[PDB]
Design a protein around this ligand. Structure first.
Ligand SMILES: Nc1ncnc2c1ncn2[C@@H]1O[C@H](COP(=O)(O)OP(=O)(O)O)[C@@H](O)[C@H]1O
Ligand SMILES: Nc1ncnc2c1ncn2[C@@H]1O[C@H](COP(=O)(O)OP(=O)(O)O)[C@@H](O)[C@H]1O
Ligand SMILES: Nc1ncnc2c1ncn2[C@@H]1O[C@H](COP(=O)(O)OP(=O)(O)O)[C@@H](O)[C@H]1O
Ligand SMILES: Nc1ncnc2c1ncn2[C@@H]1O[C@H](COP(=O)(O)OP(=O)(O)O)[C@@H](O)[C@H]1O
Ligand SMILES: Nc1ncnc2c1ncn2[C@@H]1O[C@H](COP(=O)(O)OP(=O)(O)O)[C@@H](O)[C@H]1O
Lengths: 186, 131, 116, 228, 523, 65, 213, 135, 77
């Protein structure tokens, strides 16, 4: 039923069309990356006006009717619970990988083969990050540097006026609900 | 940016005309190179795979594309071999330049950079050669 | 006869040449298929009957399997050309396959046209 | 003025068969890339805008509901294969369109359709006879327990996957979950639940029903958690 | 601007001029009707992907179903279709004989009219050849039914009619229908297709079917009673549900206790309603729609056999046999309008319980063929073979005369008629000879549908008939265009099937030739 | 490229970009450090989304007639 | 409380009770039973489960991973893994998967078609080439070169191969029987029958009829 | 690119040369064998040379196409070398191109096709020589 | 990749395989069209002088540098 006016497009013309949609969501957010990121003026359905550069808030308000772009938003919904900070880094990196993949489709690579290549490189990257990592609170429960590092990231947001008082508050909260020995915070 | 003045259109005009001469002569490379059909204006037709003969019988009118034709003649006088490989290399470098120019890199920086690769390139081939 | 032999030989080589030798085998059947149409007979059946008598010669050399069976145009039925006397020179079938192969090679190498 | 059709659209002969052959290939193309475990997915959108992503051939054909007459024949045939077996709809759909494609040039050359049917009915029975003659029964090959061979077949589908390093654990979870059931086995019975976080080896296999239990209301230190 | 249309003065209808051959146009409408069914002729007939008016897909090769679904609007084609409907009377086969033969008579008539022969002289030749064909057809009668009521005999002759409707499965269907037909032929002079009913059930395949006596109904008995010999059968069209009063009957409920009181009052009333069924001496009840849960237990309380017939045609099937008519009210104790039956019981066949109305006390002259199939479209196409198969032997209750099939009679009858036209001087020989060539279209249909050069079949069929080898027809085979004897193979057609087909086909063709102009009207 | 060359030629330890226009690179001095679980999930979720998009070649939606 | 209906109905068929909306009809008719019930601590959160129910024909498998795609991709592969184990125990007769059986039939039917004079020769051979699509699309979908594999695969069957087929993991041919890539023979038999029966319905059709509505 | 002529590349050039050689074959396909049908040859003036001999047709056949002229030059090689079999040559070569063009659509390079046809001709001459009968 | 294409091989897998053989081996690894695949070119005796490869990069790069320096063209009379 309703076969008339049915969407029908496949092959490289479809993949490049899907890649074209993901790039628009990435390029829209590529400028809002970092503390020097350009804000985004969001107008609500109720007529409100807001301005911010939060990657998560940009995607929640961005009601892209394209289906491939909706998956990019569903991805970020889970990232806020795992990473928190680099929500723009995920979308910007995905758009970069898809943009570089478009150069490979012209060379004649299959999408599933590119998928296997990135999975192999993603393991090489994840293996390299542990080598260049460093500890902070190893073998000791300390509260001084834990207040320092969290205070640096907060300085970019509107809490910059009283950024120091917020960091000490975030430490006593997690320290209260959870124990640093068990290392399972809720 | 505004980009009111657009002199880059002449770069893409010279790169496209230069890349066109390479794309035609590409398939005729090697012993198994696919032959090509040339038809003279009188009516005669011939078949050949020698890249030097094909460039002469192309009647190239663009200035930038003529530089690849005169380039192939320089290789014949100096070396006498690799006539087709030169035009294919130049077409790919210019095609690669089309990606760099879009990124905002100047032709002079690209020009000076390629000379450094040429300087290191000659050392690579000379080291792995057989005296 | 070559339609069955070359089709079996194609399975031995491989290496992006199994399909080409198989299409070379199928291409030769146009001659008995064309001779059958000109003789006002069903080319699909007579071409199939030739390949069956020739394939049986390949399965085993037993005398019950007919051998060297040709195509009679008048009666519209296969016939043994050794008895019927329908013979041709060897150089014809050899040169015609060689020259026809060189011609298709000369055209397949043409991937471009330049006019002046 | 006085015509026979008067809206009755009808065409017959070779053009009708060739039209149905091409319409059947469209259904093949819709499920051609989903063949195999590593097949490409398919995105389907209903009228409400809800998305549907799945690489199962049977689930794709149910959501299409193509209105072409010849296409409905393959869909109803494939749907019956899903109800009876639940697997092989893509193989049936691809082979049918491919049998139709190979006989397409012969149909155009004046070959009758009925002669083609005698070939499929003949070649099919010869193929079914060749399967049973060459097929092999494997019950206790090499004196190996069935729990071990089924482990090899389980990890085969799981090989070179995101859980390839720990598929030995995941391979046993499949054999354990299937062996827990009675003689009447079914895929719907053995449910699965997802829990984000934690190592891959920490995937648990509850013998009964399990759920997240978002109930966090008052009632602690009472309500004994054990019952006979 | 003049000159406009010529001979156009009646409602602006498309009146073909003398150059446009108005007669040639009504013939073309009939030729197109043949091509829609010329391919479905024979055992190798091609199926038609018919789209019902309800947007339902059905794949079949039956002629009556094709024309019933194909809205034939041309009147010149309706006449031939009316002959097909008249063909269904006095015989249940030979429908495509009317379409293929009449299409050849009209198609060949154009070759005569183009020469200049008058349409009135063409009609006289076909009428003379039809009368001559009826004199030659008795001489072609090869065998005749022994009337021994033998399943080995009835099944053997029935194979020809079953084929061309459901090919390949002609062995099972011939045995089953033979078992159903043989059980009524003892009822001398009363055989009819209305007795031999059909009941389709979703099942494994056609091989899992069988025959059972009495009016079988696929819906199992809903009640808990296994068997009951009660004659009074109460049929109701209204389902067992919440009652409504035909008068005002205003029901007001406010509190929750009053809801339970009225609910109890309804159950006490329904208990009295089902009580009234047993009070009228009737332990059987039928229902069209749903059946309530409490009323179901009431049927088991008084051991009243509950019956469910959702199909309307199943209900009317009982109204004309047992007499139980459906009333509009829900369980009115109307004992006068109830039915009468000798035995009613449940029976499990093919792993399915089916309601049965068997006639144990009475002699019994009714049967039913319980078909099994994994597709509703397949069983329906097999049902059409039962009608054309059973009706073949309804004709054999008349004069038992069989003729060869497979196009054998069509060549001999053409050969005998062609000789009559060669020696007959005058202008009628032109139409008499073409009447013989019209018979050749039927072997040409069988040959084309089997993938064989038709001209080679006619050449061989005439040679063997020239040597006197009658009863020789087309050997149905893809890779063998030769011929074989229809008697040795057992392929035989009915005499009355060819008699009434050649008669009605000629009248339909002559009736179309007599017409020369189609004119509109208004009341 | 200047930061990348410094990660090889100048010194082997990793060095970042001075986006806030502070003194210089080597964010370790600037005290700008992200979680290891953060970066591991960042490029993992990004790759998983690319594979999910690369393995889709047909978006079928019926139109209104 | 707050139990999903699917989990409740899954426990309904496992315990053998009934989900009654109103609490007024709650009695022994709807109440279920179980042998051993215990509240565990899977991943910190509590998970209720009744073990050893009377109608215990069901179970549940809780997955764990670093993200949803680790579990979703794992969810798809395990559902077929359950069917593979479910198939091997039911039907002991099997054949090599990955298109290995399809290439063997292509050799038998093609060599058989030569001995069949008539129009059936080209068609039985056409039936054979149609079986190539199953091992072909597995190579095309896996990103491999179907030419190099099919030519190397069809050559192996001629020399004596009977189980060699397509390997989705490694871009080469492999003995799918020794690799334990099996499928039920009767399920594969029903695929060819339904395929030919479906093609025969389309080939046997010559005209389409449409009642004007 | 700007030039004093015209250029055309791609797979369609192979197809254009395939359909050309296939056309020349159909002109001498029905006239194959001793029961071959005659064919007209309308010259530029108006004369009509009617004949069924394939060699006589190709000598007079004038199709202004390069691929067709290759088969005309090919005819002279077979006529001078042997003097027979020219009709089967043009027909065999036309089917090899129509079949090879289908392989090229299946991503089979012409070099792999050219290699297969060369080995097939070698083995075909071997099977022919092994199955002769001397005078 | 152009030589591999003309030899019927895959243009990508040929150069992709050779880039690993050159990282591990030497310049002996190259495309052999006589055999139709990758082989040790030093054993096949298929070599060319050094001036061909050096003069090619020298003259080609100078032409690319010359074409890159073209800002515009002026039509004189
Ligand atoms: N003080 C800083 N100095 C240098 N780089 C920074 C600083 N703060 C954040 N960044 C960089 O900006 C990027 C985005 O940071 P953040 O704004 O927290 O995430 P998002 O842009 O996704 O909201 C990170 O990748 C990080 O490397
Ligand atoms: N016999 C051969 N085997 C492998 N490669 C070859 C062979 N002959 C030439 N080549 C390669 O083909 C390229 C072009 O060779 P050549 O035809 O002499 O120059 P051009 O194509 O410029 O006229 C060279 O780079 C060489 O490596
Ligand atoms: N591990 C594997 N290796 C090779 N081939 C496989 C593997 N798993 C499945 N296949 C192939 O994939 C095809 C399709 O399998 P499946 O998805 O179960 O059926 P369908 O695609 O009809 O739903 C089968 O023909 C089988 O041969
Ligand atoms: N096995 C057979 N061989 C030859 N002819 C057959 C065979 N079976 C049936 N026929 C022919 O098919 C024709 C049509 O039969 P049927 O379909 O019952 O009537 P209609 O086509 O008028 O509906 C008959 O005239 C009969 O001769
Ligand atoms: N007596 C014959 N019987 C059957 N076939 C013949 C006979 N004579 C010639 N042929 C066929 O006719 C074809 C053409 O023969 P010929 O005219 O000598 O060559 P060409 O047609 O190329 O000039 C040959 O391929 C041969 O098979």
């Amino acid at each position: 039923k309703d076969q008339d006016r049915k969407s029908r497009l496949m092959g490289l013309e479809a993949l490049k069309s899907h890649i074209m949609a993901a790039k628009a969501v990435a390029n829209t957010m590529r400028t809002s990356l970092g503390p020097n990121g350009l804000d985004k003026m969001m107008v609500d359905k109720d007529g409100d006006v807001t301005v911010t550069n939060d990657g998560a808030t940009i995607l929640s308000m961005m009601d892209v009717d394209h289906q491939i772009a909706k998956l990019m938003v569903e991805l970020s919904k889970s990232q806020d619970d795992e990473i928190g900070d680099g929500t723009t880094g995920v979308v910007v990196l995905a758009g970069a990988l898809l943009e570089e993949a478009e150069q490979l489709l012209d060379r004649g690579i299959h999408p599933i083969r590119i998928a296997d290549g990135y999975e192999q490189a993603a393991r090489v990257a994840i293996e390299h990050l542990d080598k260049i990592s460093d500890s902070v609170l190893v073998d000791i429960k300390d509260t001084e540097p834990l207040i320092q590092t969290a205070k640096t990231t907060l300085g970019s947001k509107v809490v910059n006026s009283c950024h120091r008082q917020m960091a000490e508050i975030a430490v006593n909260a997690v320290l209260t609900v959870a124990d640093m020995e068990r290392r399972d915070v809720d | 940016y505004q980009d009111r003045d657009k002199p880059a259109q002449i770069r893409f005009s010279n790169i496209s005309a230069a890349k066109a001469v390479a794309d035609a002569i590409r398939t005729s490379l090697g012993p198994k190179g696919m032959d090509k059909m040339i038809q003279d204006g009188k009516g005669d037709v011939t078949i050949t795979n020698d890249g030097a003969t094909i460039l002469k019988q192309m009647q190239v009118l663009h200035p930038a594309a003529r530089m690849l034709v005169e380039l192939s003649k320089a290789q014949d006088i100096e070396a006498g071999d690799g006539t087709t490989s030169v035009v294919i290399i130049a077409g790919s470098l210019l095609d690669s330049c089309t990606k760099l120019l879009q990124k905002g890199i100047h032709p002079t920086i690209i020009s000076e950079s390629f000379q450094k690769a040429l300087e290191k390139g000659i050392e690579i081939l000379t080291d792995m050669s057989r005296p | 006869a070559l339609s069955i032999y070359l089709e079996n030989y194609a399975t031995s080589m491989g290496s992006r040449e199994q399909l080409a030798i198989a299409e070379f085998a199928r291409s030769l059947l146009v001659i008995p298929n064309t001779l059958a149409v000109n003789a006002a007979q069903d080319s699909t059946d007579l071409v199939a009957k030739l390949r069956a008598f020739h394939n049986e010669a390949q399965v085993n050399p037993e005398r019950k399997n007919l051998k060297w069976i040709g195509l009679d145009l008048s009666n519209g039925k296969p016939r043994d050309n050794k008895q019927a006397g329908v013979f041709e020179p060897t150089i014809v079938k050899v040169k015609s396959l060689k020259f026809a192969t060189e011609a298709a090679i000369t055209i397949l190498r043409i991937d471009d046209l330049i006019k002046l | 003025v006085i015509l026979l059709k008067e809206g009755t659209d009808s065409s017959q002969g070779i053009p009708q068969l060739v039209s149905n052959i091409s319409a059947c290939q469209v259904i093949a193309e819709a499920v051609r890339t989903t063949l195999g475990p590593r097949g490409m997915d398919k995105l389907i959108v209903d009228g409400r805008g809800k998305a549907t992503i799945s690489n199962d051939g049977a689930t794709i054909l149910k959501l299409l509901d193509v209105v072409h007459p010849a296409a409905k024949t393959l869909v109803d045939i494939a749907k019956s294969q899903d109800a009876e077996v639940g697997d092989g709809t893509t193989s049936v759909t691809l082979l049918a369109a491919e049998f139709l494609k190979q006989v397409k040039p012969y149909v155009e050359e004046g070959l009758h359709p009925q002669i083609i049917i005698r070939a499929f009915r003949t070649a099919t029975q010869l193929a079914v006879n060749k399967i049973k003659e060459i097929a092999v029964t494997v019950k206790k090959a090499d004196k190996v327990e069935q729990r071990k061979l089924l482990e090899k077949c389980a990890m085969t589908a799981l090989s070179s996957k995101l859980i390839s390093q720990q598929k030995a654990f995941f391979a046993k979870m499949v054999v354990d979950a299937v062996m827990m059931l009675d003689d009447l086995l079914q895929l719907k019975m053995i449910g699965i639940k997802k829990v984000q976080g934690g190592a891959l080896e920490d995937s648990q296999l509850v013998a009964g029903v399990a759920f997240k239990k978002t109930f966090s209301y008052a009632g602690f230190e009472m309500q004994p958690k054990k019952y006979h | 601007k003049a000159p406009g249309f010529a001979q156009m003065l009646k409602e602006g209808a498309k009146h073909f001029s003398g150059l446009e051959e108005a007669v040639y146009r009504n013939i073309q409408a009939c030729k197109e009707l043949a091509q829609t069914t010329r391919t479905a002729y024979g055992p190798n007939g091609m199926n038609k992907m018919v789209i019902n008016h309800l947007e339902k897909l059905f794949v079949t090769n039956d002629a009556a179903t094709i024309l019933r679904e194909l809205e034939v609007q041309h009147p010149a084609a309706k006449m031939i279709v009316m002959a097909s409907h008249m063909q269904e009377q006095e015989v249940g086969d030979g429908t495509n004989f009317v379409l293929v033969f009449a299409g050849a008579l009209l198609e060949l008539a154009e070759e005569l009219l183009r020469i200049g022969l008058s349409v009135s002289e063409v009609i006289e030749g076909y009428e003379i050849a039809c009368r001559k064909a009826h004199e030659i057809l008795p001489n072609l009668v090869c065998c005749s039914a022994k009337n021994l009521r033998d399943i080995d005999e009835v099944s053997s002759l029935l194979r020809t009619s079953i084929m061309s409707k459901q090919y390949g499965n002609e062995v099972f269907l011939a045995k089953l229908i033979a078992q159903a037909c043989v059980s009524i032929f003892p009822d001398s002079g009363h055989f009819n297709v209305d007795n031999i009913r059909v009941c389709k059930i979703l099942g494994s395949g056609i091989s899992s079917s069988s025959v059972l006596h009495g009016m079988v109904f696929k819906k199992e008995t809903e009640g808990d009673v296994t068997s009951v010999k009660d004659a009074k059968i109460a049929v109701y069209s209204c389902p067992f549900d919440g009652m409504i009063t035909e008068t005002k009957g205003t029901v007001l409920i406010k509190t929750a206790e009053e809801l339970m009181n009225f609910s109890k009052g309804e159950e006490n009333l329904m208990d009295a309603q089902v009580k009234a069924i047993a009070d009228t001496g009737a332990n059987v009840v039928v229902t069209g729609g749903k059946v309530a849960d409490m009323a179901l237990h009431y049927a088991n309380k008084y051991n009243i056999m509950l019956v469910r017939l959702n199909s309307k045609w199943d209900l009317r099937r009982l109204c004309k046999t047992v007499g139980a008519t459906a009333l509009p009210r829900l369980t009115p104790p109307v004992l006068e309008e109830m039915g009468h039956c000798d035995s009613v019981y449940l029976s499990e066949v093919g792993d399915t319980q089916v309601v049965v109305f068997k006639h144990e006390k009475e002699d019994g002259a009714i049967s039913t063929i319980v078909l099994r199939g994994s597709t509703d479209n397949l069983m329906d196409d097999i049902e059409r073979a039962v009608d054309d198969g059973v009706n073949t032997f309804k004709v054999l209750t008349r004069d038992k005369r069989l003729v060869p099939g497979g196009g054998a009679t069509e060549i001999e009858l053409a050969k005998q008629i062609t000789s009559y036209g060669e020696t007959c001087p005058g202008l009628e020989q032109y139409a008499i000879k073409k009447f013989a060539e019209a018979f050749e279209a039927i072997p040409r249909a069988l040959a084309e549908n089997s993938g064989v050069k038709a001209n080679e079949v006619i050449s061989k069929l005439y040679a063997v008939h020239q040597e006197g080898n009658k009863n020789v027809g087309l050997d149905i085979e893809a890779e063998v265009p030769a011929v074989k004897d229809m008697l040795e193979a057992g392929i035989l057609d009915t005499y009355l099937g060819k008699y009434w087909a050649i008669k009605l086909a000629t009248n339909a063709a002559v009736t179309v030739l007599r017409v020369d102009q189609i004119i509109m009207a208004k009341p | 490229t200047e930061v990348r060359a410094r990660q090889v030629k100048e010194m082997n330890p990793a060095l970042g970009i001075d986006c806030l226009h502070k003194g210089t690179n080597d964010m370790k001095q600037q005290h700008v450090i992200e979680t290891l679980i953060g970066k591991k999930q960042q490029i993992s979720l990004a790759t998983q989304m690319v594979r999910m998009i690369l393995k889709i070649d047909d978006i079928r939606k019926p139109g209104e007639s | 409380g707050r139990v999903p209906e699917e989990d409740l109905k899954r426990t309904m068929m496992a315990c053998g009770g009934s989900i009654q909306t109103s609490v007024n009809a709650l009695s022994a008719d709807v109440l279920g039973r179980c042998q051993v019930f215990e509240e565990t601590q899977i991943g910190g959160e509590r998970y209720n489960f009744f073990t050893g129910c009377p109608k215990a024909k069901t179970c549940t498998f809780i997955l764990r991973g670093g993200a949803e795609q680790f579990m979703e991709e794992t969810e798809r592969s395990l559902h077929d893994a359950i069917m593979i184990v479910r198939r091997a125990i039911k039907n002991d007769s099997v054949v090599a998967g990955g298109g290995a059986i399809e290439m063997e039939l292509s050799k038998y039917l093609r060599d058989y078609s030569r001995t069949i004079p008539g129009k059936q020769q080209l068609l039985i051979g056409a039936y054979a080439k149609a079986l190539e699509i199953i091992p072909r699309q597995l190579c095309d979908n896996a990103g491999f070169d179907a030419t190099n594999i099919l030519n190397k695969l069809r050559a192996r069957h001629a020399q004596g191969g009977t189980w060699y087929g397509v390997d989705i993991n490694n871009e080469d041919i492999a003995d799918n029987f020794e690799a334990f890539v099996w499928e039920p023979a009767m399920v594969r038999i029903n695929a060819l029958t339904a395929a030919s029966e479906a093609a025969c319905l389309i080939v046997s059709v010559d005209e389409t009829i449409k009642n004007p509505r | 690119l700007s030039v004093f002529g015209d250029r055309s590349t791609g797979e369609t050039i192979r197809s254009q040369n395939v359909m050309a050689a296939a056309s020349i074959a159909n002109i001498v396909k029905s006239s194959l064998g001793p029961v071959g049908l005659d064919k007209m040859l309308v010259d530029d003036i108006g004369d009509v040379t009617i004949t069924n001999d394939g060699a006589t047709i190709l000598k007079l056949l004038e199709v202004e196409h390069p691929a067709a002229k290759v088969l005309c030059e090919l005819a002279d090689l077979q006529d001078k070398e042997v003097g027979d079999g020219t009709t089967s040559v043009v027909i065999i070569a036309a089917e090899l191109l129509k079949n090879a063009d289908e392989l090229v659509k299946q991503k089979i390079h012409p070099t792999s096709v050219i290699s297969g046809y060369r080995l097939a001709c070698k083995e075909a001459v071997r099977y022919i020589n092994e199955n002769l009968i001397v005078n | 990749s152009t030589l591999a294409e003309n030899a019927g091989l895959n243009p990508i897998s040929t150069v992709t395989e050779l880039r690993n053989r050159h990282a591990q081996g030497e310049k002996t690894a190259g495309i052999n069209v006589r055999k139709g695949g990758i082989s040790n070119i030093l054993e096949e005796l298929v070599v060319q002088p050094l001036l061909v490869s050096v003069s090619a990069l020298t003259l080609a790069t100078e032409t690319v540098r010359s074409i890159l320096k073209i800002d515009d063209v002026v039509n004189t009379r």
